Amino acid sequence: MERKISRIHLVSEPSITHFLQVSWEKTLESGFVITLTDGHSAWTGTVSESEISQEADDMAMEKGKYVGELRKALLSGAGPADVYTFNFSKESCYFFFEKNLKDVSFRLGSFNLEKVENPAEVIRELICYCLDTIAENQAKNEHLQKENERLLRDWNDVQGRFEKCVSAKEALETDLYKRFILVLNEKKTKIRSLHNKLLNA
Amino acid sequence: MERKISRIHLVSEPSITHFLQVSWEKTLESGFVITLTDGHSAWTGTVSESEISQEADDMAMEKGKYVGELRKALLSGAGPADVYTFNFSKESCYFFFEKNLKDVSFRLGSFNLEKVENPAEVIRELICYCLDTIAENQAKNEHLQKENERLLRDWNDVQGRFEKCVSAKEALETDLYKRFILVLNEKKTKIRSLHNKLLNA
Amino acid sequence: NQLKEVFSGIKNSNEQTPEEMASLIADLEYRYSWDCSPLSMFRRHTVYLDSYAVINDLSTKNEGTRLAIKALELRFHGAKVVSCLAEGVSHVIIGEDHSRVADFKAFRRTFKRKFKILKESWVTDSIDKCELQEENQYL
């Protein structure tokens, strides 16, 4: 069970903004439930799998593209170049959404909703869910920050250890090579002395 | 500007949850605004620095301690060993909260809230603020998770690099020692040849 | 065992300087053709990193990235990591940030001796091979 909340500004009433929550079990292919609210009244509707199939058949549109467009519009997936317009009529209890492109609008979907007996329950549930999600996000942020701090400390420890290793390697190399060059210089001096003695005799 | 929402259960109606939001400019000491809503109607009130100071003086406690207790109560900061009772008389439009403690009720605060004629606007504003907060938290969490993944990858890379470096360090000494022994043996052969030539001469 | 005992006999020797020690090491490698060893093959080449937000400044270190560990690995293998962009620099490594490639090219043109532009992935790939891969594929 997953629910997503979005804000829509109806062209009929641009000043006011409505909140629509869509709840689905696993995917929208099997339908879902949409609840629209304005702060004073609420409407509810169901788009169960049968309704989605009927709409797709009526529109003669591919199911994959249908679900993709639903993801883009209902879940607020619209891109920068994609604009969708929603219009809800309470007198007819209808709610239809379309896409505007190249100054021409293509109908995308239309549903029917029934006014709930009382909106207070819907408002309270929405606010409770929002607060719970905020608390969960706060907890996740704290945990991620602690993990990031631990990881940064570990990286600093690694850097220090590698610095120590490279310094030790360099020191060992220079010391051993200095000893070797000293020994070789002594050997070369002896070689030169022996060569001079051989030349003498 | 800071705001904090919380859920409470009024003793008058222990069946629904009322959402109260406390908004303060910079700190709770300077004052705050309390807005309580049950999802249908909203009551707004304000408390200033003078009122808080008078309340602290009346109850004979330090201003800091009283402010801390007020934050613990209203802002949902209650710990494990504490409980508070909030009651709002709608007929008198009088809200007040007390600290229940082992069959002893202590009045903690009391305000007079005036019902607002447009609860829809405040409900929509609260919902919009919650949506913005959750969106910002989700974006921050995603960014932090990406940073953590990057740091983990870097840590694995550097750890493997250190493993290889330390593995090669031990063989470094053996290799240079073998090279030194080889060159010294060559010098040994040269000096032996020179000595043999000198003896022959 | 004899060589170890002889080396242990010497007490200490700290009379030379890093430049003199590097020159002596390079001379020994050239004389005895010891350049085929897996390490110390970067000794003849000086290496620079783009770890500073502003070129030739010692107060803007960008520590906290993969560049530092890359430089440390290069130095361990034998590369001479130099902190001042002298005219004698021969190898320069630039990471994912290519903003200052033009400045590096201009500096290379100005300098009498040109240093080939190199990337961080080249050394990362070359460590496993322990050989100097052609820079034409990583310019």
Side-chain angles (χ1 to χ4, degrees):
Chain A
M1 171 36 48
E2 282 288 0
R3 69 199 274 181
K4 183 61 152 42
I5 304 145
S6 158
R7 324 186 233 159
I8 59 109
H9 300 240
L10 296 183
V11 172
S12 162
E13 307 111 282
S15 72
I16 72 193
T17 180
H18 302 346
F19 305 106
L20 77 94
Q21 64 180 20
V22 291
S23 284
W24 69 97
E25 301 290 354
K26 304 302 309 321
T27 89
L28 330 171
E29 171 48 42
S30 64
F32 47 94
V33 62
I34 78 196
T35 318
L36 194 143
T37 174
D38 325 314
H40 194 33
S41 87
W43 298 272
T44 315
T46 60
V47 297
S48 85
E49 196 159 30
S50 34
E51 301 188 41
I52 309 311
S53 42
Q54 202 281 331
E55 290 290 314
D57 283 18
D58 196 295
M59 281 217 86
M61 186 175 283
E62 302 298 319
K63 208 68 156 266
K65 200 219 188 163
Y66 201 151
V67 60
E69 172 265 288
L70 289 194
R71 282 309 206 294
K72 289 199 269 165
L74 267 48
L75 282 289
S76 94
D82 275 309
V83 50
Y84 316 131
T85 311
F86 313 77
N87 257 22
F88 156 77
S89 82
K90 32 188 83 77
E91 281 73 52
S92 166
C93 327
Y94 264 12
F95 160 82
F96 63 97
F97 60 88
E98 328 191 36
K99 170 226 290 184
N100 315 77
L101 186 131
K102 288 180 177 186
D103 301 335
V104 59
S105 89
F106 313 150
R107 194 291 291 280
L108 281 179
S110 60
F111 302 132
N112 66 86
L113 289 89
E114 71 86 10
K115 172 167 289 206
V116 82
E117 47 256 33
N118 54 344
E121 316 313 324
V122 182
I123 309 318
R124 293 207 226 84
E125 183 62 21
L126 185 56
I127 298 161
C128 270
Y129 170 55
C130 283
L131 298 206
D132 273 318
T133 325
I134 295 266
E136 289 179 3
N137 280 12
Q138 203 64 50
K140 260 184 61 41
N141 177 85
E142 158 273 347
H143 153 277
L144 257 60
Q145 186 56 83
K146 300 331 293 157
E147 295 290 50
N148 179 281
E149 167 49 34
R150 183 267 305 288
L151 275 161
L152 209 57
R153 181 146 204 161
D154 184 1
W155 185 95
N156 295 117
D157 289 345
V158 173
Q159 200 73 352
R161 154 171 81 241
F162 209 63
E163 289 167 303
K164 195 76 68 49
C165 167
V166 76
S167 272
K169 176 262 191 188
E170 145 171 23
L172 165 141
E173 182 74 346
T174 166
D175 188 2
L176 286 190
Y177 250 101
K178 244 284 200 170
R179 268 189 252 285
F180 169 82
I181 76 86
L182 176 52
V183 159
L184 201 43
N185 190 33
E186 198 160 281
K187 196 73 78 206
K188 268 289 215 194
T189 38
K190 184 93 175 132
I191 291 264
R192 204 73 60 174
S193 87
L194 257 291
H195 181 64
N196 199 348
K197 213 151 105 183
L198 179 66
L199 256 293
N200 289 117
Chain B
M1 181 55 68
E2 249 177 37
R3 188 183 303 172
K4 172 52 157 287
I5 329 300
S6 185
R7 317 173 275 192
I8 58 169
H9 286 291
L10 270 53
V11 293
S12 294
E13 36 261 41
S15 57
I16 65 197
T17 167
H18 293 219
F19 312 93
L20 84 167
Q21 63 175 6
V22 190
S23 56
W24 57 92
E25 278 54 39
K26 329 203 181 182
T27 176
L28 216 31
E29 293 177 350
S30 43
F32 49 77
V33 163
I34 308 289
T35 285
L36 184 140
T37 185
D38 57 5
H40 208 174
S41 307
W43 303 263
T44 298
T46 312
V47 190
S48 300
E49 177 55 89
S50 76
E51 186 155 5
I52 301 300
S53 96
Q54 163 49 13
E55 224 161 32
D57 183 349
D58 182 291
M59 292 182 29
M61 29 199 307
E62 305 96 331
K63 188 95 157 290
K65 209 174 289 306
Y66 177 64
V67 166
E69 191 70 7
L70 220 74
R71 151 167 48 264
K72 184 142 63 61
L74 287 169
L75 277 46
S76 88
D82 65 9
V83 63
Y84 304 81
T85 284
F86 319 141
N87 42 36
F88 181 34
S89 322
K90 287 145 206 213
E91 61 93 2
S92 169
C93 318
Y94 186 81
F95 168 88
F96 69 95
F97 53 107
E98 50 193 7
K99 170 144 150 168
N100 268 22
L101 158 62
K102 259 194 81 179
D103 289 345
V104 168
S105 295
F106 200 116
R107 192 131 306 161
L108 225 37
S110 92
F111 327 118
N112 321 62
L113 311 176
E114 172 53 30
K115 166 163 71 57
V116 289
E117 298 174 350
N118 202 20
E121 146 43 52
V122 58
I123 284 296
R124 267 141 53 168
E125 187 172 2
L126 172 54
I127 293 179
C128 276
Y129 158 78
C130 273
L131 260 58
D132 284 345
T133 304
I134 180 171
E136 211 204 345
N137 285 331
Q138 202 151 279
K140 196 195 305 310
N141 271 10
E142 273 182 5
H143 169 83
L144 197 48
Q145 183 254 0
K146 270 179 168 235
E147 216 77 348
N148 255 29
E149 154 202 29
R150 182 213 50 68
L151 183 175
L152 201 63
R153 184 210 33 63
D154 182 280
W155 173 81
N156 275 329
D157 289 345
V158 62
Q159 192 67 10
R161 174 61 31 61
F162 163 100
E163 301 336 307
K164 168 160 278 198
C165 181
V166 158
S167 187
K169 168 154 137 163
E170 300 103 358
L172 191 153
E173 159 163 331
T174 314
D175 190 4
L176 66 106
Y177 256 98
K178 204 172 297 317
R179 236 160 51 234
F180 293 177
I181 208 74
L182 180 60
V183 61
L184 272 193
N185 264 29
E186 194 268 322
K187 281 291 194 211
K188 277 1 165 53
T189 300
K190 173 61 72 169
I191 210 81
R192 164 181 41 211
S193 39
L194 292 159
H195 191 81
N196 198 337
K197 172 154 189 169
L198 187 70
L199 274 162
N200 289 347
Chain C
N1 302 349
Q2 312 195 23
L3 175 62
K4 181 66 64 157
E5 298 267 29
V6 170
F7 265 45
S8 39
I10 291 87
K11 308 203 80 67
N12 193 32
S13 189
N14 196 343
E15 299 81 20
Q16 288 288 271
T17 77
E19 275 178 22
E20 301 158 13
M21 313 144 33
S23 82
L24 291 165
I25 298 264
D27 182 316
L28 293 169
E29 309 336 310
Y30 162 84
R31 192 77 197 71
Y32 308 117
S33 163
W34 290 336
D35 249 347
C36 78
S37 313
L39 315 174
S40 192
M41 61 86 88
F42 311 85
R43 202 66 47 72
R44 274 211 211 171
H45 335 99
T46 306
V47 298
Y48 227 63
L49 286 201
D50 189 31
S51 41
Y52 274 140
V54 193
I55 295 162
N56 294 0
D57 306 274
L58 299 175
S59 291
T60 180
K61 189 67 125 171
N62 302 336
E63 62 189 0
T65 174
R66 183 180 65 255
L67 308 180
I69 61 163
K70 288 287 138 284
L72 254 65
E73 164 267 310
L74 259 292
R75 191 253 294 276
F76 148 71
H77 261 63
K80 196 249 284 180
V81 167
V82 72
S83 49
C84 184
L85 200 139
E87 293 177 350
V89 179
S90 176
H91 284 44
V92 292
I93 314 302
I94 310 178
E96 61 267 41
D97 189 4
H98 298 65
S99 295
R100 295 177 174 71
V101 298
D103 303 346
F104 282 116
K105 289 177 179 181
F107 300 158
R108 181 194 46 68
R109 296 244 199 177
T110 304
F111 298 164
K112 192 209 80 173
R113 271 188 176 177
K114 294 132 173 56
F115 52 92
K116 59 180 161 165
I117 291 156
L118 288 153
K119 39 178 61 46
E120 64 88 39
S121 74
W122 162 64
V123 304
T124 326
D125 302 318
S126 83
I127 301 139
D128 162 46
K129 241 162 65 177
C130 324
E131 78 94 22
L132 209 67
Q133 315 201 347
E134 289 178 351
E135 67 99 41
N136 296 323
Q137 292 140 57
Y138 305 95
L139 186 73

Coordinates of all heavy atoms in Angstrom, one line a residue, chain A residues 121-154:
Chain A
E121 N -12.5 13.8 8.5 CA -11.7 12.5 8.6 C -10.6 12.5 7.6 O -9.5 12.1 7.9 CB -12.7 11.3 8.4 CG -14.0 11.4 9.2 CD -13.8 11.9 10.6 OE1 -12.8 11.5 11.3 OE2 -14.7 12.6 11.1
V122 N -10.9 12.9 6.3 CA -9.9 12.8 5.3 C -8.8 13.8 5.6 O -7.6 13.5 5.5 CB -10.5 13.1 3.9 CG1 -9.5 13.1 2.8 CG2 -11.7 12.2 3.6
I123 N -9.1 15.0 6.1 CA -8.1 16.0 6.4 C -7.2 15.5 7.5 O -6.0 15.7 7.4 CB -8.8 17.4 6.7 CG1 -9.8 17.8 5.7 CG2 -7.7 18.5 6.9 CD1 -9.3 17.6 4.2
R124 N -7.8 15.0 8.6 CA -7.1 14.5 9.7 C -6.1 13.4 9.3 O -5.0 13.3 9.7 CB -8.0 14.1 10.8 CG -8.8 15.2 11.4 CD -9.1 15.0 12.9 NE -10.5 15.3 13.2 CZ -11.6 14.5 12.9 NH1 -11.4 13.3 12.4 NH2 -12.8 14.9 13.2
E125 N -6.6 12.4 8.5 CA -5.8 11.3 8.0 C -4.6 11.8 7.2 O -3.5 11.4 7.3 CB -6.6 10.3 7.2 CG -5.9 9.1 6.8 CD -5.3 8.3 7.9 OE1 -5.8 8.4 9.1 OE2 -4.4 7.5 7.7
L126 N -4.9 12.8 6.3 CA -3.8 13.3 5.5 C -2.8 14.0 6.3 O -1.6 13.8 6.1 CB -4.4 14.3 4.5 CG -3.5 14.9 3.4 CD1 -2.8 13.8 2.6 CD2 -4.2 15.9 2.5
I127 N -3.2 14.8 7.3 CA -2.2 15.5 8.1 C -1.4 14.5 9.0 O -0.2 14.7 9.1 CB -2.9 16.6 9.0 CG1 -3.6 17.6 8.1 CG2 -1.9 17.3 9.9 CD1 -4.7 18.4 8.8
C128 N -2.1 13.5 9.5 CA -1.4 12.5 10.3 C -0.3 11.8 9.4 O 0.8 11.6 9.9 CB -2.4 11.5 10.9 SG -3.0 12.0 12.5
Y129 N -0.7 11.4 8.2 CA 0.2 10.7 7.3 C 1.4 11.7 7.0 O 2.6 11.2 7.0 CB -0.5 10.3 6.1 CG 0.5 9.8 5.0 CD1 1.4 8.8 5.2 CD2 0.5 10.4 3.7 CE1 2.3 8.4 4.3 CE2 1.3 9.9 2.7 CZ 2.2 8.9 3.0 OH 3.1 8.5 2.0
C130 N 1.1 12.9 6.7 CA 2.2 13.9 6.4 C 3.2 14.0 7.6 O 4.4 14.0 7.4 CB 1.6 15.2 6.1 SG 1.0 15.3 4.4
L131 N 2.6 14.1 8.8 CA 3.5 14.3 10.0 C 4.3 13.0 10.2 O 5.5 13.1 10.6 CB 2.7 14.6 11.2 CG 1.9 15.9 11.2 CD1 1.7 16.4 12.7 CD2 2.6 17.0 10.4
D132 N 3.7 11.8 10.1 CA 4.4 10.6 10.2 C 5.6 10.5 9.2 O 6.7 10.0 9.5 CB 3.5 9.4 10.1 CG 2.8 9.0 11.4 OD1 3.5 9.0 12.5 OD2 1.6 8.7 11.5
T133 N 5.3 10.8 7.9 CA 6.3 10.8 6.9 C 7.4 11.8 7.2 O 8.6 11.5 7.0 CB 5.7 11.1 5.5 OG1 4.4 10.5 5.5 CG2 6.6 10.5 4.4
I134 N 7.1 12.9 7.8 CA 8.1 13.9 8.1 C 9.0 13.4 9.2 O 10.2 13.5 9.2 CB 7.4 15.2 8.6 CG1 6.7 15.9 7.4 CG2 8.5 16.2 9.2 CD1 7.5 16.9 6.6
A135 N 8.4 12.7 10.2 CA 9.2 12.1 11.3 C 10.1 11.0 10.8 O 11.3 10.9 11.1 CB 8.3 11.6 12.4
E136 N 9.6 10.2 9.9 CA 10.4 9.1 9.3 C 11.5 9.7 8.5 O 12.7 9.2 8.5 CB 9.5 8.2 8.4 CG 8.6 7.3 9.2 CD 7.7 6.5 8.3 OE1 7.9 6.5 7.1 OE2 6.8 5.8 8.8
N137 N 11.3 10.8 7.7 CA 12.3 11.4 6.9 C 13.4 12.0 7.9 O 14.6 12.0 7.5 CB 11.7 12.5 6.0 CG 11.1 11.9 4.8 OD1 10.9 10.7 4.7 ND2 10.8 12.8 3.8
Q138 N 13.0 12.6 9.0 CA 13.9 13.1 9.9 C 14.8 12.0 10.5 O 16.1 12.2 10.6 CB 13.2 13.8 11.1 CG 14.0 14.9 11.8 CD 14.4 16.0 10.9 OE1 13.6 16.6 10.3 NE2 15.7 16.4 10.9
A139 N 14.2 10.9 10.8 CA 15.0 9.8 11.4 C 16.0 9.3 10.3 O 17.2 9.0 10.6 CB 14.1 8.7 11.8
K140 N 15.5 9.1 9.1 CA 16.4 8.6 8.0 C 17.5 9.6 7.7 O 18.7 9.2 7.5 CB 15.6 8.4 6.7 CG 15.2 7.0 6.5 CD 14.5 6.8 5.1 CE 15.3 7.2 4.0 NZ 16.8 6.8 4.1
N141 N 17.2 10.9 7.8 CA 18.3 11.9 7.6 C 19.3 11.8 8.7 O 20.5 11.9 8.4 CB 17.7 13.3 7.5 CG 18.7 14.4 7.4 OD1 19.2 14.7 6.3 ND2 19.1 15.0 8.5
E142 N 18.9 11.7 9.9 CA 19.8 11.6 11.0 C 20.7 10.3 10.9 O 21.9 10.4 11.1 CB 19.1 11.5 12.4 CG 19.9 10.9 13.5 CD 19.7 9.4 13.6 OE1 18.8 8.8 12.9 OE2 20.5 8.8 14.3
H143 N 20.1 9.2 10.5 CA 20.9 8.0 10.4 C 21.9 8.1 9.2 O 23.1 7.7 9.3 CB 20.0 6.8 10.1 CG 20.6 5.7 9.3 ND1 20.7 5.7 7.9 CD2 21.2 4.5 9.7 CE1 21.3 4.6 7.5 NE2 21.6 3.9 8.6
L144 N 21.5 8.7 8.1 CA 22.4 8.9 7.0 C 23.5 9.8 7.3 O 24.7 9.6 6.9 CB 21.6 9.4 5.8 CG 21.3 8.4 4.7 CD1 20.4 7.3 5.2 CD2 20.6 9.1 3.5
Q145 N 23.2 10.9 8.1 CA 24.3 11.8 8.5 C 25.3 11.1 9.4 O 26.5 11.3 9.3 CB 23.7 13.0 9.2 CG 24.7 14.1 9.6 CD 25.4 14.6 8.4 OE1 25.0 15.5 7.6 NE2 26.6 14.1 8.2
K146 N 24.8 10.3 10.4 CA 25.7 9.6 11.2 C 26.6 8.6 10.4 O 27.8 8.5 10.6 CB 25.0 8.8 12.3 CG 24.1 9.6 13.2 CD 24.6 11.1 13.5 CE 26.0 11.1 14.2 NZ 26.7 12.3 13.9
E147 N 26.0 7.9 9.4 CA 26.8 7.0 8.6 C 27.8 7.8 7.8 O 28.9 7.3 7.6 CB 25.8 6.2 7.7 CG 24.9 5.3 8.4 CD 25.6 4.1 9.0 OE1 26.6 4.3 9.7 OE2 25.1 2.9 8.7
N148 N 27.4 9.0 7.3 CA 28.4 9.8 6.5 C 29.5 10.2 7.4 O 30.7 10.2 6.9 CB 27.6 11.0 5.9 CG 28.6 11.9 5.1 OD1 29.3 12.7 5.7 ND2 28.5 11.8 3.8
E149 N 29.2 10.6 8.6 CA 30.3 11.0 9.5 C 31.3 9.9 9.8 O 32.5 10.0 9.8 CB 29.7 11.6 10.8 CG 30.8 11.8 11.9 CD 32.0 12.5 11.5 OE1 31.9 13.4 10.6 OE2 33.1 12.2 12.0
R150 N 30.7 8.7 10.1 CA 31.5 7.5 10.3 C 32.4 7.2 9.1 O 33.6 6.9 9.2 CB 30.6 6.3 10.7 CG 31.4 5.1 11.0 CD 31.6 4.2 9.8 NE 30.4 3.8 9.1 CZ 29.5 3.0 9.6 NH1 29.6 2.4 10.8 NH2 28.4 2.7 8.9
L151 N 31.8 7.3 7.9 CA 32.6 7.0 6.7 C 33.7 8.0 6.4 O 34.8 7.6 6.0 CB 31.6 6.9 5.5 CG 30.9 5.6 5.3 CD1 29.7 5.7 4.4 CD2 31.8 4.5 4.7
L152 N 33.4 9.3 6.7 CA 34.4 10.3 6.6 C 35.6 10.1 7.5 O 36.7 10.2 7.2 CB 33.8 11.7 6.7 CG 34.5 12.8 6.0 CD1 34.5 12.6 4.5 CD2 33.8 14.1 6.3
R153 N 35.2 9.7 8.8 CA 36.3 9.4 9.7 C 37.1 8.2 9.3 O 38.4 8.2 9.4 CB 35.7 9.1 11.1 CG 36.7 8.8 12.2 CD 36.3 9.3 13.6 NE 37.4 9.6 14.5 CZ 37.3 10.4 15.5 NH1 36.2 11.0 15.9 NH2 38.4 10.5 16.3
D154 N 36.5 7.2 8.8 CA 37.2 6.0 8.3 C 38.1 6.4 7.1 O 39.3 5.9 7.0 CB 36.2 4.9 7.8 CG 36.8 3.6 7.4 OD1 38.1 3.6 7.4 OD2 36.2 2.7 7.0

